[PDB]
Design an enzyme around this catalytic site. Sequence first.
Site, PDB file in Angstrom:
ATOM      1  CG  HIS A  11      65.340  52.668  47.423  1.00 49.72           C
ATOM      2  ND1 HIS A  11      64.488  53.704  47.109  1.00 49.72           N
ATOM      3  CD2 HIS A  11      65.170  51.739  46.457  1.00 49.72           C
ATOM      4  CE1 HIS A  11      63.821  53.409  46.012  1.00 49.72           C
ATOM      5  NE2 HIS A  11      64.221  52.225  45.593  1.00 49.72           N
ATOM      6  NE  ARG A  19      64.931  62.771  57.214  1.00 48.02           N
ATOM      7  CZ  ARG A  19      64.340  62.366  58.330  1.00 48.02           C
ATOM      8  NH1 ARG A  19      64.920  62.555  59.496  1.00 48.02           N
ATOM      9  NH2 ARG A  19      63.183  61.732  58.279  1.00 48.02           N
ATOM     10  CG  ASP A  20      66.153  71.211  53.058  1.00 50.43           C
ATOM     11  OD1 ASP A  20      66.424  72.420  52.912  1.00 50.43           O
ATOM     12  OD2 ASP A  20      67.054  70.370  52.847  1.00 50.43           O
ATOM     13  CE  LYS A  39      62.405  55.882  41.402  1.00 42.60           C
ATOM     14  NZ  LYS A  39      63.015  54.536  41.655  1.00 42.60           N
ATOM     15  CB  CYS A  80      62.759  62.861  46.764  1.00 38.69           C
ATOM     16  SG  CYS A  80      64.041  63.008  48.028  1.00 38.69           S
ATOM     17  CB  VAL A 102      60.566  50.260  54.912  1.00 36.80           C
ATOM     18  CG1 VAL A 102      60.789  51.646  55.459  1.00 36.80           C
ATOM     19  CG2 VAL A 102      61.648  49.311  55.417  1.00 36.80           C
ATOM     20  CG  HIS A 113      61.197  45.938  44.873  1.00 36.92           C
ATOM     21  ND1 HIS A 113      61.074  46.957  43.944  1.00 36.92           N
ATOM     22  CD2 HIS A 113      59.957  45.733  45.376  1.00 36.92           C
ATOM     23  CE1 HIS A 113      59.813  47.340  43.886  1.00 36.92           C
ATOM     24  NE2 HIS A 113      59.113  46.613  44.742  1.00 36.92           N
TER      25      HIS A 113
END
Length: 121
Positions: A11, A19-20, A39, A80, A102, A113
């Site tokens: 993470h 960031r594409d 995932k 993603c 966040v 987590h």
Amino acid sequence: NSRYTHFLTQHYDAKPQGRDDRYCESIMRRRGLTSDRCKPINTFIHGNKRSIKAICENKNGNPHRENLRISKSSFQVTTCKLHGGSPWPPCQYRATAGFRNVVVACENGLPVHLDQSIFRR
């Protein structure tokens, strides 16, 4: 820690490039998140580690729901999301860049987590 290092692995990406779509496919592979199963959704946080672990104290966090913490500040994030029918490699991903706070769970003053619900969407 092993949970915290596991969180950073899954993470954290300090200084992303692009960031594409192609950033997602490549960082998902590189971090071992497609080795057996693709995932389905994963979010990376960008910037410095110290702002992220500061969500664990009152400096940059508030109590949230059940045993969670929500940041006071906003982070650059990249979600993603798996695109296609199958969960099996090869894994194709759509990137969604954002800027918001966040939700994390902390253990012994470290984040262990990431709540993905707030990024589903």
